[PDB]
A paper describes a structure:
LT and CT belong to the AB5 toxin family, consisting of one A-subunit and five B-subunits. The A-subunit is catalytically active and is anchored to the center of the torus-shaped B-pentamer, which is responsible for the binding to epithelial cells. There are two natural variants of LT, one isolated from human-infecting ETEC (hLT) and one from porcine-infecting ETEC (pLT).
Given the inconclusive results from the SPR analysis presented in Section 2.3, we decided to determine the crystal structure of pLTB in complex with branched LNnH. The structure was obtained after co-crystallization and refined to a resolution of 1.45 Å (R/Rfree = 17.5/20.1). The crystal contained two B-pentamers in the asymmetric unit, giving us access to 10 crystallographically distinct B-subunits. The B-pentamers are positioned “top-to-top”, with the primary binding sites on opposite ends, similarly to recent LTB and CTB structures. Ligand binding stabilized the 50s loop (residues 51 to 60), which is disordered in all other subunits. The β6-branch is folded back on the reducing end of the sugar, with the β6-glycosidic bond interacting with Arg13. The terminal galactose of the β6-branch is exposed, explaining why substitution can occur at the 2-, 3-, or 4-position. Both ligand binding sites are in close proximity to neighboring molecules in the crystal, with similar contacts in both cases, therefore we cannot exclude that the β6-branch may adopt a different conformation (or be less ordered) in solution.
Residue numbers in the entry:
A (entry chain H), C (entry chain F), D (entry chain E): 1 to 103
B (entry chain G): 1 to 51, 58 to 103
E (entry chain D): 1 to 53, 57 to 103
Write the structure that this text describes.
């Protein structure tokens, strides 16, 4: 298996690493029908989502989507710094595939 | 997908934005009725509640979010609410600062 | 719908308000037998429970009981003040129907 | 129903109270081989476990075991003092039936 | 039953104890398809994974271990030892102990 977020990101076609080195500025959570999603923003200007679950997700990803939303909420509330994001760069906004937290 | 709570709120009928800019004053949780109800109030006097499988998971998540937001004294920026319920029902929450 | 715990509690038979205005003194969690009790006590001497009733089989009611047990545990660990409890007064100790926290 | 962990523990022949009055010294969590177990130790030298028994198949009993594992982890990480444990003395390490926290 | 992480680790082939005595430097979580995994690193240079999910009880234990590593990281809690499957890349966590 990959040993870093950068190695993991390199295994997929539509993915890109963003170096963030910052805490989350804003956390938005929606339970509105067809938009059950989380949006995060940084003071540096980047906005990212965790996508609404759909056919782009295999069964093993359903629990992982719920875990990632849990992780973003507690990361926001604790003002924990995000090091890197691996994102699907074909979505609007960019969709989080993996997160690393450091410092 | 929308990139802000204001853009998301604009996609639905019977919704409006409340600008809160404050921490939750009170958190109430009840299992007395047919549906579990969570009610939050602000010092302004404004009161809000929480109303397929993906919709059930999102309702449980929103209740979890309001509880931990209350306990951590975290400031709420905006709420997107359904204004056809009394008290108004939360569709989305944003937190900043 | 009700806007306060006092209004909500007035809608139910065999319920009363206890005004607490205090943090939980002790938290007890048991998986002995089938009631799976959580017991909280206050410095006042008052004791309350959250239990799974023998009669209770409906999934949404079980999820609400699990949520209330989660709320009492994190309220205890964070030393958060409880304002009021709405309790079923026909059980010993009284069983919690609703909780409010303020201040 | 019982109002204290000592009263609850007295209802079962194969249980006994250990009075701890201390935080957990060590927390061990294992998913090696067939049964997940959690082991806690105290400075006194006393050691206790939470596991799902091989015989145990009922969903409500599994949910209570998962809750107790969650409670021991957050109690350890928050350095929260344990008052008493009610334990099954049927096997070693003794298995936790109930936990109380105070002070 | 075993009373220590060393005793638990000894029951299985392909396991090793690592003495860590340190807080986690970085926590990585992925929801990418076929790589739903956690990676943790230490400033001392060690990297470990929690593997992609086994019967249902093993899947629940993997989800619990990922939960434990996240809150251990956020609380800056010291890890004493790890029991790892040493045949996996990176080494895969079978058990964790925390003290001090
Ligand atoms: C369009 C294209 O160029 N396709 C390539 C192919 O690329 C990889 C993809 O293969 C699909 O399967 C192919 C299958 O291999 C073919 O044999 C069959 O005929 O067509 C199928 C359909 O294309 C997989 O279905 C793809 O999986 C999906 O991949 C997308 C990413 O693109 C994922 O979506 C992402 O999801 C995440 C969340 O999980 C985010 O939301 C993100 O935003 C979103 O983008 C899906 O999750 C994923 N789904 C599943 C179920 O896994 C993908 O793996 O590669 C093959 C082999 O290299 C090429 O085949 C070659 O084609 C050339 C002609 O170009 C020539 O004929 C060769 O002989 C032949 O091998 C395809 O052309
Ligand atoms: Na932006
Ligand atoms: Na701050
Ligand atoms: Na803050
Ligand atoms: Na407070
Ligand atoms: Na405060
Ligand atoms: Na039980
Ligand atoms: Na304190
Ligand atoms: Na006993
Ligand atoms: Na300490
Ligand atoms: Na304390
Ligand atoms: Na070390
Ligand atoms: Na920190
Ligand atoms: Na620090
Ligand atoms: Na600590």
């Amino acid at each position: 298996a990959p040993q870093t977020i950068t190695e993991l990101c390199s295994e997929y076609r539509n993915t890109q690493i963003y170096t963030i080195n910052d805490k989350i500025l804003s956390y938005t959570e929606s339970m509105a029908g067809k938009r059950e999603m989380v949006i995060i923003t940084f003071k540096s200007g980047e906005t990212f989502q965790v996508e609404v679950p759909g056919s782009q997700h295999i069964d093993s990803q359903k629990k992982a989507i719920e875990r990632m939303k849990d992780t973003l909420r507690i990361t926001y509330l604790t003002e924990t710094k995000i090091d890197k994001l691996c994102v699907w760069n074909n979505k609007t906004p960019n969709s989080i595939a993996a997160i690393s937290m450091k410092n």
